[PDB]
Design a protein around this ligand. Structure first.
Ligand code: NI
Length: 341
């Protein structure tokens, strides 16, 4: 049965709420982005209206085989009406096609649902600036002060310099990037760009990238592994076994692998600057752990919330346990007392 935090009060609307069968009273199902925990339950068998970004709709059509009649894509940054309610979709700075949703309720209440997001200062000069927001449905993935991480740009610069040096040193080395969902594409696109290469990958992965409205994408990606010095593999294969095995498959065309594993936070973020990072190595294979986050750090989340000054916060992540809920309520209370709302 559908939880309160996926319901929008005073509408027939739900968010990211497809795994409970038919939700009684729901007249429109929003989907914030194409990640499986959020789309869970959607299939070609779904026959109610789904509202989402154009990218998310392309994915729904092509990967999930949801029928076109049920897919209602909306442009971003544009005031639209849905079932007689005014709504706006905003860029979430998460994965391709991910959005936050602004609901302007008939009674005059304004609600922001962040979906999944990485808070940024640019969000402070959006349509959010134009009026008070009363309720915030918040991505609390890293809502604890230990969660720090570098900027996406620091990480990319690091990846670029590292790959360029290794391949200029050994022109027969192969660059491999690990992947499991959409998101974090800039890792492999920036590396490929500095090496003058396309990125090679499986047919299933190519098909996914072809739905994302990336400019000039046909000149950036290919299913011909032979013709490419940056390859994508499933994240599960980024280990010394998987990478040796892959190296055998390429027909001796390369004699070395340099691999990247973009992770979230893991415990060593507590000490190490990006400049100090060093790989695990076994022989002619070297693996780098890089902390590329598409969720807010604790400090990013705190700044956004203290700017927005909402009357109520409703978490959407880590809600299944009392300890978690209680911990998060303590931070929200500190933030409020500090900022004076
Ligand atoms: Ni997500």
């Amino acid at each position: 049965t559908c939880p309160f935090y996926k319901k929008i009060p005073g509408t027939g609307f739900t968010v990211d709420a497809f795994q409970y069968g038919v939700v009684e009273g729901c007249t429109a199902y929003f989907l914030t982005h194409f990640h499986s925990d959020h789309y869970a339950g959607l299939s070609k068998h779904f026959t109610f209206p789904v509202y989402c970004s154009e990218i998310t709709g392309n994915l729904l059509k092509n990967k999930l085989h949801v029928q076109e009649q049920y897919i209602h894509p909306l442009p971003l940054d544009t005031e639209c009406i849905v079932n007689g309610v005014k709504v706006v979709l905003l860029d979430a700075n998460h994965c391709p096609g991910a959005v936050m949703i602004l609901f302007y309720l008939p009674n005059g209440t304004v609600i922001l649902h962040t979906g999944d997001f990485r808070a940024d200062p640019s969000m402070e000069r959006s349509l959010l600036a134009d009026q008070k927001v009363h309720m915030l449905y918040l991505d609390t993935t890293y809502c604890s002060p230990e969660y720090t991480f570098p900027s996406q740009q620091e990480v990319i610069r690091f990846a670029i310099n590292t790959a360029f040096e290794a391949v200029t040193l050994n022109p027969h080395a192969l660059v491999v990037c690990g992947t499991y969902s959409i998101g974090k594409e800039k890792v492999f696109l920036a590396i490929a760009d500095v090496l003058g290469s396309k990125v090679g990958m499986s047919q299933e992965k190519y098909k996914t990238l072809q739905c994302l409205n990336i400019p000039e994408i046909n000149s950036l990606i290919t299913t011909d592994m032979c013709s490419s010095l940056v390859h994508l593999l499933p994240m599960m294969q980024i280990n010394f076994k998987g990478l040796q095995s892959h190296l055998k498959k390429c027909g001796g065309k390369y004699n070395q692998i340099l691999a990247f594993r973009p992770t979230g936070w893991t415990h060593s973020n507590k000490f190490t600057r990006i400049a100090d990072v060093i790989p695990q190595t076994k022989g002619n294979i070297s693996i780098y752990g890089i902390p590329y986050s598409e969720h807010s750090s604790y400090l990013e989340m705190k700044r956004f919330v203290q700017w927005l000054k909402p009357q109520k916060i409703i978490p959407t992540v880590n809600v299944g346990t009392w300890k978690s809920r209680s911990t998060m309520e303590k931070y929200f209370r500190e933030w409020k007392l500090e900022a004076g709302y």
